[PDB]
Amino acid sequence: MLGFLSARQTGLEDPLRLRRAESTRRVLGLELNKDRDVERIHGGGINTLDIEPVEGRYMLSGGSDGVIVLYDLENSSRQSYYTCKAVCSIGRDHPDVHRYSVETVQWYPHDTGMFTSSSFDKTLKVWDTNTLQTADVFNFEETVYSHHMSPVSTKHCLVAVGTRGPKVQLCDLKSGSCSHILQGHRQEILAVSWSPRYDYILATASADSRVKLWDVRRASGCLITLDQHNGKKSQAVESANTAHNGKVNGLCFTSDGLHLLTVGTDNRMRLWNSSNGENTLVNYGKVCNNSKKGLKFTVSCGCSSEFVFVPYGSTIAVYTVYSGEQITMLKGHYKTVDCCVFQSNFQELYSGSRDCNILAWVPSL
Amino acid sequence: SDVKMSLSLPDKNEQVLFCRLTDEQHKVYQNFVDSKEVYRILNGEMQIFSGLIALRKICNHPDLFSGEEDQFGYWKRSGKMIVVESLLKIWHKQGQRVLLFSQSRQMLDILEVFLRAQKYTYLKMDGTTTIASRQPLITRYNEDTSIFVFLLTTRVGGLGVNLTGANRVVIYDPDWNPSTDTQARERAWRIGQKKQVTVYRLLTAGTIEEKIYHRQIFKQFLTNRVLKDPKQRRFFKSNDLYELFTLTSPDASQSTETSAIFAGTPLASSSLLAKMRARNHL
Incomplete structure (x- = not known):
């Protein structure tokens, strides 16, 4: 570290070097911080967490009990020990509270x-954070497994929604049109994720073992359908070209958006070229998921090497994205982990689980 | 409207004549709306559609439904052909040229026979004419003036066959589709029309045909709301608009149903929220 400081100070190395290297070192040193806690508010398992993309200060959390909690992640107290207090909450007494499990937020x-x-x-309820009141509601004919807004589109404000229907609903928050559907899957869509790179590229993963990339502008079906073998087992596309040998219940684009991580109930995680959907054949070993719903997992940002934090049973398994090497397994939960979200400002991780807890993992030293 | 300033467009006026039923026609229509057939229609035991066609035939002419100065299609037995008599006579005295439209080809032939009973020169084009000889007929009507009235159904010929030489146009009977009657009036009044064209839609008041016109206007309003502006003054009643097996012919003491109905004449998450709450309060 003193070598890094000196090299930054004298200009041998770009300051970029120190940032990325020290962030990587912090991530590798990621450990259950009992020096930080998250206030327990959910009566049920936390299905989803979301740290705000700008300023990373506040976090949302949706539980199976239907409540939403809005946390403050900043240590506003002067002590080194603090609890991430719950700022707001859509509780059982809020008139608009969800009747059933909040699966994505x-x-x-x-x-x-x-x-x-x-x-x-x-x-799919849209909330005004300041008033904490719903500003819009989109009813769907079938239960929602996942939704996602594009993190990049300054132009369109569509929400891709995956429900048990075989169709992917696109709901325009700009004047409200929930009629658009992308057809081509054959079973429930368990995950949807927009590309962080292209405004209109949407990757949708479903129960029929397929992941499809759509250009929602386009009127002609999916761009690419992810294939495990890339052509070794080639068939007229009616049943072949599966992304996994089971249900594909998780999607995640890498930070730059040039690759796609999909996890399926075949206990595999695969990395795909997001442009031509080619399997990069990164191994990753065996990634245990048996979730019957969407599995929310994240990748790191702004480190020398990209990581993926995937829920592995009751632990969070950390892998290197482009080599597959399992860095570590963060072990602090008591039931299966549903979601983990990455605070890229400080290389911190927040993981929710069916044990009704949100555990913060902070780098040690 | 926006492109009007680029191209010329002569003014068009339009009227809807309400033609009282003749007493024999009135009796036939009343007998049909009191006969057991319409009662079975109201029971749903028989298809309503024959009742519609029958009532349309009656309003066109009793000889259609029922089947000298007493030959087939005598023009005194229905009020709409009384009015057609008056208009044809006056327009011929004015030296104008007429398009004479009707959805029914049978009554188109009736009207043909009526024109033979008169001394008007005319021309007919319908579906029975071979397509390869359709263009000559139109050209011969458009080029000279020695042909007075051209007979059409609303749906014959390619879309917008060029009938420009005509000056006045009469839609003898309305259709269910607004677009077909709109096309009928548009066919005479197109680009390169020299003289003011006026459309006279012939209605029989208090009958099925008034209801057909009402439905045509309703569909037109529906299309307009969808395509040009949602905010619109509401004209109609659900039950009155949908019940169409009655007879209330006006006695001139009360105004007609149509006139009674027409008696008056990146986002910064706050604009996004503002638009959402605006749409939701509606």
Whole structure:
């Protein structure tokens, strides 16, 4: 570290070197901080967490009990020990509270004033953070497994919604049109994720073992359908070209958006070229998931080497994205982990689980 | 409207004549709306559509439904053809040229026979004419003036066959589709029309045909709301608009149903929220 400081100070190395290297070192040293706690408010398992993209100060959390909690992640107290207090909460007494499990919650990108949340009550509610009141509701004919707003699109403000229907619903928060559907999957869509690189590229993963990339502008079906073998087992596309040998219940684009991570109930995680959907054949070993719903996992940002923090049973398994090497397994939960979210400002991780806890993992030293 | 300033467009006026039923026609229509057939229609035991076609035929002419100065299609037995008599006579005295439209080809032939009973020169084009000889007929009507009235159904010929030489146009009977009657009036009044064209839609008041016109206007309003502006003054009643097996012919003491109905004549998450709450309060 003193070598790094000296090399930054004298200009041998770009300051970029020290940032990325020290962030990587912090991530490798990621450990359950009993020096930080998250206030327990959910009566049920936390299905989803979302740190706001701008300023990374506030975090949303949706539980199976239907409540939403809005936490402050900044140590506003002068002590080195603090609890991430719950700022707001859509509780059992809020008139608009979800009737059933909140499966996904997402801050509006570009501003912290709005956030959207979907539930097994077949609703995607848009909330005004300041008033804490719903500003819009999108009813769907079938329960929502996942929704996602594009983190990049300054132009369109569509929400891709995956429900048990075989169709992917696109809901325009700009004047409200929830009619658009992308057809081509054959079973429930368990995950949707917009590319962080291209405004209109959407990757949708479903129960039929397929992941499809769509250009929602385009009127002609999916761009690419991810294939495990890239052509070794080639068939007229009616049943082949599966991304996994089971249900694909998780999606995540890498930070730069040039690759796609999909995790499926075949206990595999695969990395795909997001442009031509080619399997990069990164191994990753065996990534244990048996989730019957969407599995929310994240990648690191702004480190020398990219990581992926994937829920592995009751632990969080940390892998290197481009080599597969399992860095470590963060072990602090008591039931299966549903979601982990990465605070890229400080290389911190927050993981929620069915044990009704949100555990913060902070780098040690 | 926006492109009007680029191209010329002569003014167009339009009227809807309400033609009282003749007493024999009135009796036939009343007998049909009191006969057991419409009662079975109201029971749903028989298809309503024959009742519609029958009532349309009656309003066109009793000889259609029922089947000298007493030959087939005598023009005194229905009020709409009384009015057609008056208009044809006056327009011929004015030296104008007429398009004479009707959805029914059978009554188109009735009207043909009526024109033979008169001394008007005319021309007919319908679906029975071979397509390869359709263009000559139109050209011969458009080029000279020695042909007075051209007979059409609303749907014959390619879309917008060029009938420019005509000056006045009469839609003898309305259709269910607004677009077909709109096309009928548009066919005479196109680009390169020299003289003011006026459309006279012939209605029989208090009958099925008034209801057909009402439905045409309703569909037109629906299309307009969808395509040009949602905010619109509401004209109609659900039950009155949908019940169409009655007879209330005006006695001139009360105004007609149509006139009674027409008696008056990146986002910064706050604009996004503002638009959402605006749409939701509605």
